[PDB]
């Protein structure tokens, strides 16, 4: 169901390549008709409310999409309810035979496993979670317990659930003994890496995404090119230049992606320009990547332009350590930067102490400040120490 959530997000807000909305709208209409989900055709009305590039034309004539009618009707709804009532009749016929038999704990749990898949495919969220809790306690081992988490993670990625899904994610991880189990490792590192995306941890995102076991590729939730897509974005923050030439540029998993998928280009244009520290080539590849990567992805476009500010902060630090004193017009004719607009670009960092760059407005030259010292490092202990003493006084006076 990767293309189900992808094409549904493309119809929310798209400021670039409006032609992709046609292939996205025509896909979600043919996918719901071929599936059993009733409400996901109705959710298109509420989910797109107050969004640029509206996909719904009823009272709003400002819709810029190519397919302007997502409107819900009773014609398709009644047809989807017939497939739901016909399938539950076959399952209840088998469950009734299982209740009268009751052979082991696997067949008793399999009755709820078939329901856990049924209630997930008919569009129920809380009703499906109630069915998954019954099969979790009746499981004979950890093999049937992790399949419960797979359905929880399926409904959690569509509705963006950071609480119930994250709690059950670490529950299967801990249990009694973890071990080297492939299911409790490969699946955990990929799903927990997706949860780190939305919260932007960046500490475990580089290790659990840029470094993957082999291909992942379950095809049910996320795909192969998606894991490599976030790897290029998250690999530019925590991973320094030492790991860029090992797990990024020289990574064997990213060598065959260039000749396979050419629509990404985030592992070449961004990596080569940063490794060579050339601002001339690095600038035009920012908007080309921003359009075809950040915007289409669901966990990226929520932030978007903030990443442009953070990615440009990386290249400013690469040049700052390469010189002490430099003229402003030198990088203008070489790296293709505007002198008049350079002060406004660097004005979002230097006063916030994000960069050590110092530009002299008299002669038009840039200098370099001290990158690190003992004084700037003790300031982190001041804010961390004062913030810790608050809990000691708060919890100390609360208990009495």
């Amino acid at each position: 169901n990767y293309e189900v959530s992808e094409k549904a997000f493309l119809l929310t807000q798209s400021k670039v390549s409006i032609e992709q909305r046609k292939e996205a709208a025509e896909f979600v209409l043919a996918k719901i008709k071929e599936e059993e989900m009733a409400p996901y055709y109705k959710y298109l009305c509420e989910e797109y409310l107050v969004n640029n590039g509206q996909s719904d034309l009823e009272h709003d004539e400002k819709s810029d999409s190519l397919n302007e009618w997502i409107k819900f009707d009773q014609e398709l709804y009644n047809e989807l309810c017939k497939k739901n009532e016909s399938k539950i009749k076959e399952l209840n016929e088998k469950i009734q035979k299982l209740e009268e038999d009751d052979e082991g704990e696997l067949e008793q749990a399999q009755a709820w496993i078939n329901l856990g898949e049924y209630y997930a495919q008919i569009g129920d969220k809380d009703n499906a979670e109630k069915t998954l809790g019954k099969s979790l306690s009746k499981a004979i081992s950890t093999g049937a317990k992790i399949d419960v988490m797979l359905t929880i993670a399926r409904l959690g990625f569509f509705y963006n659930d950071q609480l119930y899904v994250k709690e059950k994610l670490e529950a299967v991880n801990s249990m009694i003994e973890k071990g080297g189990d492939w299911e409790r490792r490969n699946r955990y590192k990929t799903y927990y890496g997706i949860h780190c995306l939305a919260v932007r941890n960046f500490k475990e995102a580089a290790k659990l995404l840029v470094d993957s076991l082999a291909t992942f590729t379950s095809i049910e939730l996320t795909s192969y090119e998606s894991i490599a897509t976030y790897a290029s974005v998250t690999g530019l923050f925590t991973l320094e230049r030492t790991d860029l030439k090992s797990k990024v540029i020289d990574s064997p998993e990213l060598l065959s992606l260039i000749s396979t998928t050419a629509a990404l280009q985030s592992i070449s244009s961004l990596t080569i320009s940063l490794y060579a520290s050339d601002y001339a080539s690095y600038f035009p590849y920012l908007l080309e990547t921003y359009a075809n990567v950040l915007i289409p992805c669901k966990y990226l476009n929520r932030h978007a332009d903030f990443f442009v500010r953070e990615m440009r902060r990386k290249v400013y630090a690469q040049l700052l350590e390469s010189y002490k004193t430099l003229s402003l017009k030198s990088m203008a004719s070489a790296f293709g930067v505007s002198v008049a607009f350079l002060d406004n670009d660097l004005g979002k960092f230097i006063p916030n102490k994000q960069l050590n760059c110092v530009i002299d407005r008299v002669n038009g030259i840039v200098e370099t400040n001290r990158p690190d010292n003992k004084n700037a490092q003790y300031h982190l202990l001041v804010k961390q120490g004062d913030g810790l003493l608050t809990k000691l006084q708060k919890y100390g006076a609360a208990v009495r």
């Binding site: 600038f283 908007l287 978007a304 332009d305 903030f306 500010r309 203008a332 293709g336 505007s338 607009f341």
Partner: peptide
């Protein structure tokens, strides 16, 4: 999140391509 994590800039978005244009023209 707050500060520039949300508001960010909201300026010079589509004008980045104009910087390369003015460099290849006025040259």
């Amino acid at each position: 999140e707050n500060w520039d994590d949300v508001e960010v800039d909201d300026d010079f978005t589509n004008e980045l391509k104009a910087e390369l244009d003015r460099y290849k023209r006025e040259n």
